[PDB]
RNA sequence: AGAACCUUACCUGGUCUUGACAUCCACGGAAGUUUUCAGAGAUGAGAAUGUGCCUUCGGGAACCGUGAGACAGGUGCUGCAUGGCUGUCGUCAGCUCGUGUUGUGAAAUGUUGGGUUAAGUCCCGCAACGAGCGCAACCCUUAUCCUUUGUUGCCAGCGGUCCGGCCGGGAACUCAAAGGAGACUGCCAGUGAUAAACUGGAGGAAGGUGGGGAUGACGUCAAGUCAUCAUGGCCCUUACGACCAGGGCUACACACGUGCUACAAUGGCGCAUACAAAGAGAAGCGACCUCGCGAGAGCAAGCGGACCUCAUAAAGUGCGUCGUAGUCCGGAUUGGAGUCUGCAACUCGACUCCAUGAAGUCGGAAUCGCUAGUAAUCGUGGAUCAGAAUGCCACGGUGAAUACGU
């Protein structure tokens, strides 16, 4: 049947959002949207690229854009001139100042978005292809992670109908909430149709960017302090 | 046990609470009389029975405040407040409550509505099938 | 199926009669959730009874109660190409429940100026028993007399299970010993 | 029955023709598409129409017709049947 | 979704604003409560009639990004199924699956 | 002499970042004077939503989503050169949010 | 998820063809503002008015107008071209790989057997063994307990107030929401392969993931999606484009799926009267007060909501009254009048007042939800939303009956 995005469930318990700004109802939405406009307006400059992914913040009274590259020398450019052009492209679109951001991707075939995409680019494209997926899986295993699945669809092999193939190595739990992970799903166009790719990577039992709860309050809290009791 | 002793009761998220002193058998609820709260009504006796069961009906207590839900849920909860609370008045009170099931908690907790249900659960009176 | 099993569920006693059977009589009179109305109907209903029979409310009340409820009823099931309603004992509490349900059913008939008057009614009826339900249940008794019959199936239940043996139903399977 | 806000609508897209329409007479009907617009004292004493969707349907305005909307004069819709429609007439 | 319906709505916003928005402040006191009458008749009430559309009745809005109508939220100005897409992902800050 | 004033608040998506933030400014605040305490928990929120699960049709199913907003009073009733800031940050940020006005 | 219009697909009439939207390039004008008139308006023509921005003051860019090769545009086909997304079996206990063994092979073994379970759950054991995913935890929610804190919250002992924590005062307590504790058949007794597990009991707030939710493996109807979105194929652009006024989407002796409401009396009506949760509100929500029979309007404190309003929530409780009368019930229909948003309530919206008035007496062959804070049953709020639900999503009130048997 159908499944949840691993991740999306997760957000706020194990995984950060994605964008990170405040907003709300009178400005929420919008924002959301600017985002949507950044994404489409910046990402066509990025895509040419080794950027996997972007995250938007927002600080502040600006916009933002953190970019994950992968690579970063290809988006920074000669003496930083680009990152200045990137951003000027932010911004633009957006109504505020914006800033770029850097990020580094990572072990690039670890990811997923960048691994995927690497196989979506080969299928666009197309080349003998197949483979790729095998690989990627090998890779990722490899660079890091405890398992990876890949799946490729749309249709495959040029076709009249639909289709789909997959590979996977290590591992990959599904219901485990938890942790973390990762994930992913990206598409795409070719002269026969849309082509689609999924990737799922299990990192093991490791903690995410957050988590969920904060550390214990009771150490802390302690009863020995003076207060109070409001109220004054 | 004391005293002045206390218990919070609860339920359906209403709640409750209950303050107890030596006395018993006098009661105030909420600021409120018991007749100005349980006009009717079964509940009430539901507020309670836990005082009759031990039990204490003429030896204490009673000062009560209860909020939220509705008049039967308030109560339930009272109950959790009076059972619990009375534990200080007891050394076997609890054991006498629990034997039961009066120390408990709640239980119940409400369920829930979900999508396509309806209440909760429930469901529509059809399945197509 | 189930597995697991679970039955009836506990109810508090109920505040006038100190009894769980009273509640249950409130609930089996209740519609929906209006327990305050139901209590008001049951005490009105018994105060009319109750004036109805005896001189008190509770002396009934047991006459109904007795009824109206039974001791036997029917079970459906199934036997060859057909289904039958075969006699069984009610369950001690259930029954009750039967029942409490018949006295409310029923009631409800019914018409009515107040419930309740209906109660109740029918208590007056039932209870004297003579009431509708008392005729209800008589039915049940029935029907079940019916059914008297048979239950067992069938050959397979009557069966294929030889034990003590007089049976040859249900138990594994039994030869000699060791 | 149902009602509407007091001081009912008149619409300008009709009023621009009503002021011409009473001076011209209607000699031909006024149409218009306004609908919705209210019948006012308003434009009484001439033929309007009124579009609907679709054709223009001519009606003379007495109202007795004030406070109704032009579209009541319209009919947009027809069918089908029992109903629709009179008995009933023959064509 | 069509570019013509998108759009429209941005035209509407927008036109509205010149008219609605400024208006509305007039409507209400020139007809409704309020008004003199000289007003309302219409007219003075044609100030409302000529622009419509620019009216809030409509202006609405809706989606947004997809454009879509009669299927959007809103608090986000977005379709919904696009809200959800998103959420999976986390493109809206603080927005997650859910459970209770 | 100290006091009221300002208030401050603090919003957010999240607990956590509200909290860190608390904390940034409320231990600051303790610290300068006081004018603090203990930060109240204050209600959070917790919105929820139901949306169509398919792009087209459905009965049943659906789906359900939430957002969430922590809020909070931090708590502070008076400004100080180190709590100004933080206030600057809080705000600079983003993921938080900050209002200061006494009202 | 709320079709007078818009939205809109469709119809009649008006009307345009590089276009309402969009990109390259050139030519003429700053963008823009103000204003009259014909016309249903689209649209067209006339009149007044600004002369900006960057700058080398040459020139350039923005924005408007005109013009060509391209081309834009298409809610237009194709879901049997395809991606992404989803229904549903169904939270069902299954699905699968590696190696070894076994069969010429499909495939078997393991994954079946024995005890046990909600379960390829847990345990036991064999040419099967090793390993992964699903089941299950995590993570949210509900509530017993421990602890820090105290306004937009609270009030036990102290105090003014003819009785609001309003305020001096207070932190025992509620609550808010942050951290912590607890459940493992653990413990005791019995059963059983001294296993796992199950039954019984104590302890505990709770007894067996305490309860509820998220969660949907593998695989499928040659399932649904051109109407979120994406995008190949095919096709018009002499338009499958686009602007405007009106009409239609709502027509009518029909039938159905799903929902509402009544037939009353453990009900209605008039008066007195008690106890909620949740949620929205910066061209918005809103009390006191004023006006009107009233919708509503005026006036206006408060607020961005733990600070306010809906709000005496209704069922329920107290008192009078009805006697089965088509009613003291029901109140479809239908006349008249008033209020409301909006360009506008004619076809065809919502609310209020007066009057009028019908089927309906608890309903066939038949059928559906639910195992307890559930069903049954009473009220409230919100999204969507100029305005506008008896649907949908969430909320709290009262609160059952019965569970033998398989």
Swiss-Prot record, chain C:
InterPro entries per record: Ribosomal_uS7 (IPR000235), Ribosomal_uS7_bac/org-type (IPR005717), Ribosomal_uS7_CS (IPR020606), Ribosomal_uS7_dom (IPR023798), Ribosomal_uS7_dom_sf (IPR036823)
Keywords (A to Z) from UniProt: Ribonucleoprotein, Ribosomal protein, RNA-binding, rRNA-binding, tRNA-binding
One function term, GO molecular function aspect: tRNA binding
One Gene Ontology cellular component: cytoplasm
Cysteine pairings via disulfide bonds: none
Keyword ATP-binding attached: no
Outcome, altering residue 35 to A/E: Defective in ribosome assembly
Keyword tRNA-binding: yes
A GO biological-process term: cytoplasmic translation
Additional comment: The strain K12 sequence is shown. Has been predicted to contact the N-terminal domain of IF-3 based on footprint studies; exactly how IF-3 interacts with the 30S subunit is controversial.
Quaternary structure and interacting proteins, as annotated: Part of the 30S ribosomal subunit. Contacts proteins S9 and S11. Cross-links to IF3 and the P and E site tRNAs.
Its job: One of the primary rRNA binding proteins, it binds directly to 16S rRNA where it nucleates assembly of the head domain of the 30S subunit. Is located at the subunit interface close to the decoding center, where it has been shown to contact mRNA. Has been shown to contact tRNA in both the P and E sites; it probably blocks exit of the E site tRNA.
Family, per entry: Belongs to the universal ribosomal protein uS7 family.
Record's protein name: Small ribosomal subunit protein uS7
The organism of origin for this protein: Escherichia coli (strain K12)
Gene: rpsG
Curated annotation (Swiss-Prot), chain D:
Keywords tagged on the record: Ribonucleoprotein, Ribosomal protein, RNA-binding, rRNA-binding, tRNA-binding
GO terms under biological process: cytoplasmic translation; ribosomal small subunit assembly
Presence of keyword Cell wall biogenesis/degradation: no
Name of protein: Small ribosomal subunit protein uS19
GO molecular function ontology, one term from the record: structural constituent of ribosome
Phylogenetic classification of the source organism: Bacteria, Pseudomonadati, Pseudomonadota, Gammaproteobacteria, Enterobacterales
CC annotations in GO: cytoplasm; cytosol; cytosolic small ribosomal subunit
Keyword match DNA repair: no
Record's function text: In the E.coli 70S ribosome in the initiation state it has been modeled to contact the 23S rRNA of the 50S subunit forming part of bridge B1a; this bridge is broken in the model with bound EF-G. The 23S rRNA contact site in bridge B1a is modeled to differ in different ribosomal states, contacting alternately S13 or S19. In the 3.5 angstroms resolved ribosome structures the contacts between L5, S13 and S19 bridge B1b are different, confirming the dynamic nature of this interaction. Bridge B1a is not visible in the crystallized ribosomes due to 23S rRNA disorder.
Family: Belongs to the universal ribosomal protein uS19 family.
PROSITE patterns reported in the protein's UniProt record: RIBOSOMAL_S19 (PS00323)
SUPFAM superfamilies to which the protein is assigned, alphabetical: Ribosomal protein S19
Impact after mutating residue 82 to Y: In MW145; suppresses a rimM deletion
Subunit structure comment from the entry: Part of the 30S ribosomal subunit. Binds S13 and L5 and cross-links to the A site tRNA.
UniProtKB/Swiss-Prot annotation, chain E:
Keyword terms, alphabetized: Ribonucleoprotein, Ribosomal protein
InterPro entries on file: Ribosomal_uS14, Ribosomal_uS14_bac/plastid, Ribosomal_uS14_CS
Pfam family, one: Ribosomal_S14
GO CC entries: cytoplasm; cytosolic small ribosomal subunit; small ribosomal subunit
A biological-process GO annotation: translation
GO function terms (MF aspect): rRNA binding; structural constituent of ribosome; tRNA binding
Subunit structure: Part of the 30S ribosomal subunit. Contacts proteins S3 and S10.
Family under the similarity heading: Belongs to the universal ribosomal protein uS14 family.
Function: Binds 16S rRNA, required for the assembly of 30S particles and may also be responsible for determining the conformation of the 16S rRNA at the A site.
Name under which the protein is recorded: Small ribosomal subunit protein uS14
Higher taxonomy: Bacteria, Pseudomonadati, Pseudomonadota, Gammaproteobacteria, Enterobacterales
Gene name linked to the record: rpsN
Curated annotation (Swiss-Prot), chain F:
Biological processes, Gene Ontology terms: cytoplasmic translation; regulation of DNA-templated transcription elongation; ribosome biogenesis; transcription antitermination
Domain of life: Bacteria
GO MF annotation list: structural constituent of ribosome; transcription antitermination factor activity, RNA binding; tRNA binding
Record carries keyword RNA-binding: yes
Keyword Ribosomal protein: yes
Transmembrane segments: none
Keywords tagged on the record: Ribonucleoprotein, Ribosomal protein, Ribosome biogenesis, RNA-binding, Transcription, Transcription antitermination, Transcription regulation
Cellular component per GO, a single term: transcription elongation factor complex
PANTHER family referenced in this protein's UniProt entry, alphabetically: 30S RIBOSOMAL PROTEIN S10 FAMILY MEMBER (PTHR11700)
Similarity-based family: Belongs to the universal ribosomal protein uS10 family.
Summary of the function given for this chain in its UniProt record: Involved in the binding of tRNA to the ribosomes. Part of the processive rRNA transcription and antitermination complex (rrnTAC). The complex forms an RNA-chaperone ring around the RNA exit tunnel of RNA polymerase (RNAP). It supports rapid transcription and antitermination of rRNA operons, cotranscriptional rRNA folding, and annealing of distal rRNA regions to allow correct ribosome biogenesis. In complex with NusB is involved in the regulation of ribosomal RNA (rRNA) biosynthesis by transcriptional antitermination.
Protein name, as recorded: Small ribosomal subunit protein uS10
């Amino acid at each position: 049947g159908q499944k949840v995005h691993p991740n999306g469930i997760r957000l706020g318990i194990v995984k950060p959002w994605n964008s990170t700004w405040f907003a709300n109802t009178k400005e929420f939405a919008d924002n959301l949207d600017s985002d949507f406009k950044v994404r489409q307006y910046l990402t066509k400059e990025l895509a040419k690229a080794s950027v996997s992914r972007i995250v938007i913040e927002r600080p502040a009274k600006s916009i933002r854009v953190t970019i994950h590259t992968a690579r970063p020398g290809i988006v920074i450019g000669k003496k930083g001139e680009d990152v200045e052009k990137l951003r000027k492209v932010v911004a633009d679109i957006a109504g505020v100042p914006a800033q770029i951001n850097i990020a580094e991707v990572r072990k690039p075939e670890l990811d997923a978005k960048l691994v995927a995409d690497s196989i979506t680019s080969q299928l666009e494209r197309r080349v003998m292809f197949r483979r790729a997926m095998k690989r990627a899986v090998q890779n990722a295993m490899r660079l890091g992670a405890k398992g990876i699945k890949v799946e490729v669809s749309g249709r495959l092999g040029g076709a009249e109908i639909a289709r789909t193939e997959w590979y996977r190595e290590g591992r990959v739990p599904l219901h485990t909430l938890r942790a973390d992970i990762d994930y992913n799903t990206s598409e795409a166009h070719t002269t026969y149709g849309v082509i689609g790719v999924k990737v799922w990577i299990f990192k093991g039992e490791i903690l995410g960017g957050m988590a969920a709860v904060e550390q214990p309050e009771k150490p802390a809290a302690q009863p020995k302090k003076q207060q109070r009791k409001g109220r004054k | 046990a004391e005293n002045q002793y206390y218990g919070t009761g609860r339920r359906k998220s209403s709640a409750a609470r209950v303050f107890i002193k030596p006395g018993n058998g006098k009661i105030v609820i909420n600021q409120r009389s018991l007749e100005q709260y349980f006009g009717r009504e079964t509940a009430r006796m539901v507020v309670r029975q836990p005082l009759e069961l031990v039990d204490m009906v003429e030896k204490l207590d009673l000062y009560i405040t209860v909020k939220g839900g509705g008049i039967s849920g308030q109560a339930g909860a009272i109950r959790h407040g009076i059972t619990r609370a009375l534990m200080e008045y007891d050394e076997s009170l609890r054991s006498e409550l629990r034997k039961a099931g009066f120390v408990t908690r709640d239980a119940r907790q409400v369920e829930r509505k979900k999508v396509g249900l309806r209440k909760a659960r429930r469901r529509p009176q059809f399945s197509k099938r | 199926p189930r597995r697991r099993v679970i039955g009836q569920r506990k109810i508090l006693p109920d505040p006038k009669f100190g009894s769980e059977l009273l509640a249950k009589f409130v609930n089996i009179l209740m519609v929906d959730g209006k327990k305050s109305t139901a209590e008001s109907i049951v005490y009105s209903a018994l105060e009319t009874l109750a004036q109805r029979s005896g001189k008190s409310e509770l002396e009934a009340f047991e006459v109904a109660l007795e009824n109206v409820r039974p001791t036997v009823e029917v079970k459906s099931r199934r036997v060859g190409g057909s289904t039958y309603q075969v006699p069984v004992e009610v369950r001690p509490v259930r029954r009750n429940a039967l029942a409490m349900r018949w006295i409310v059913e029923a009631a409800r008939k019914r018409g009515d100026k107040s419930m309740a008057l209906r109660l109740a009614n029918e208590l007056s009826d039932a209870a004297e028993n003579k009431g509708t339900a008392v005729k209800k249940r008589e039915d049940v008794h029935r029907m079940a007399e019916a059914n008297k019959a048979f239950a067992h199936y069938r050959w397979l239940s009557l069966r294929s299970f030889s034990h003590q043996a007089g049976a040859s139903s249900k138990q594994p399977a039994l030869g000699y010993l060791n | 029955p149902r009602s509407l806000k007091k001081g009912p609508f008149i619409d300008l897209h009709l009023l621009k023709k009503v002021e011409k329409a009473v001076e011209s007479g209607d000699k031909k009907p006024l149409r218009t598409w306004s609908r919705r617009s209210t019948i006012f004292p308003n434009m009484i004493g001439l033929t309007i129409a009124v579009h609907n969707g679709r054709q223009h349907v001519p009606v003379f305005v007495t109202d007795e017709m004030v406070g109704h909307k032009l579209g009541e004069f319209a009919p947009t819709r027809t069918y089908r049947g029992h109903a629709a429609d009179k008995k009933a007439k023959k064509k | 979704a069509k570019q013509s319906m998108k759009a429209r709505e941005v035209k509407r916003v927008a036109l509205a604003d010149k008219y609605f928005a400024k208006r509305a402040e007039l409507k209400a006191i020139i007809s409704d409560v309020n008004a003199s009458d000289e007003d309302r008749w219409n007219a003075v009430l044609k100030l409302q009639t000529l622009p419509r559309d620019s009216s809030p009745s409509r202006q609405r809005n809706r989606c947004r990004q997809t454009g879509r109508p009669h299927g959007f939220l809103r608090k986000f100005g977005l379709s919904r199924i696009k809200v959800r897409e998103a959420a999976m992902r986390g493109e809206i800050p603080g927005l997650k699956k859910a459970s209770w | 002499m100290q006091n009221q004033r300002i208030r401050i608040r603090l919003k957010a998506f999240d607990h956590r970042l509200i909290d860190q933030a608390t904390a940034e400014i409320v231990e600051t605040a303790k610290r300068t004077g006081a004018q603090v305490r203990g930060p109240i928990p204050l209600p959070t929120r917790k919105e929820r939503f139901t949306v169509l699960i398919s792009p087209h049709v459905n009965k049943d199913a659906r789906d359900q989503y939430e957002i969430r907003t922590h809020l909070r009073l931090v708590d502070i009733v008076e400004p100080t050169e180190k709590t100004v800031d933080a206030l600057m940050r809080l705000d600079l940020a983003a993921g938080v949010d900050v209002q200061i006005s006494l009202g």
